[PDB]
Each structure stands twice: as C-alpha cells, then as structure tokens.
Amino acid sequence: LDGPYQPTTFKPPNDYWLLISSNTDGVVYESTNNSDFWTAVIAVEPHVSQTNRQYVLFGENKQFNVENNSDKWKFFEMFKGSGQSDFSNRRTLTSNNRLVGMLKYGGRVWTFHGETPRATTDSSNTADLNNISIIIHSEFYIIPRSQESKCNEYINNG
C-alpha cells in the first residue's frame, strides 16, 4: 500500500481512506474547512485516570479532561460545528492497532469508531467537504475505496 507519507498539511482527495498510524499520545490530526466542520483526534494511552491535558488544536492551546481506564489506546474525535462553538467528544475508537481512518465521500466524512476488532464506519455531514484540509501528526497510508475491505482489516487487525 501507498506510503507512509510523512506528517504534513494535506488536502485529502475524495474516495480515498487516510489510514493514520498514531505513535504517541497527543493530537493525531486536525481537520477543518473553517465553515461548518472541525475535527481533531486526541490519542490517550491506557491507564490514564481522569486528568487535564493541554493540546494545540487549530493554532490555539486547549485543555481537555481525559480518562482511559482500559488496556487499549483510545482515540477521541473532538468535533465542533462552528468556529465560535465549543468542542465535544463525538466518537471514540478503542484499539491497540493504533490506526484511525478518514474518508471524504458523498458529501460526508467517514471515520472508524467503537472497539476493535468490531470497529465500524460512521459519517458526519458538511456542506463544504471539498475545502476540508488536515494537519496529520503521524505517518499515514492512502487506500482507494476500490480497496476499502483492506482499510477495514487494518483498523481492526493491524
């Protein structure tokens, strides 16, 4: 498969999964169109009891109270729907394969959430899908929709 690509600011094409390989706690990527969609994935290592941590999302430092009592890495999707609106934990992937996925498709962003090995795809709407840029902080792989079954096997089995 195609990569790794090195961390960078990326404008992702339609009909391609970004398989993103997180190597450490912190921001995994920051995704926005600056209109109706912000999404940042915070990674939290196993056995973190509720505590406050500082993260730098979209050029501003921000504190989140995070906990992971599981023996599995947790990837918290932090969504907001306008620039002047506050962040929410919309979805959680719990996985020791430490891969997230992102796909621009059919005027929606699809991602993996739930627990491996039965993590599943879910969509989020946007009215400006094409102007979604993304700062990715780890090595990533590009998979075509043509090979979408492979993206699935990797999220859930590594």
Ligand X SMILES: CC(=O)N[C@H]1[C@H](O[C@H]2[C@@H](O)[C@@H](CO)O[C@@H](O[C@H]3[C@H](O)[C@@H](O)[C@H](O)O[C@@H]3CO)[C@@H]2O)O[C@H](CO)[C@@H](O[C@@H]2O[C@@H](C)[C@@H](O)[C@@H](O)[C@@H]2O)[C@@H]1O[C@@H]1O[C@H](CO)[C@H](O)[C@H](O)[C@H]1O[C@@H]1O[C@@H](C)[C@@H](O)[C@@H](O)[C@@H]1O
Strands 2-5 and 139-144: antiparallel
Q: In angstroms, rounded to a whole number, what is the distance separating the alpha carbons of residues 158 and 156?
A: 6
Q: With respect to ligand X, which residue has the nearer C-beta, 8 or 125?
A: 125
Which of residues 18 and 109 has its CB atom nearest to ligand X in the complex?
109
Residues of the shown chain interacting with ligand X in the complex, contacts defined by CB under 6 A = 90-92, 94, 113-115, 120, 122
For the beta carbon of residue 59, count every other beta carbon within 10 angstroms: 7
- The nearest distance, CB 122 to ligand X, in angstroms, is 4
Q: Which is nearer to ligand X, 8 or 85 (CB)?
A: 85
Cα-Cα-Cα-Cα dihedral sign, residues 16, 32, 24, 70: negative
Contacts 24+ apart (CB under 8 A), 81-84: 81/36, 81/37, 81/38, 82/36, 83/34, 83/38
Least Å distance, CB 88 to ligand X, is: 9
Name the minimum Å distance from CB 89 to ligand X: 8
Q: Which one, 51 or 89, has the nearer CB to ligand X?
A: 89
Q: Whose CB is nearest to ligand X? A: 114
Give min distance, CB of 139 to ligand X, in A.
Answer: 24
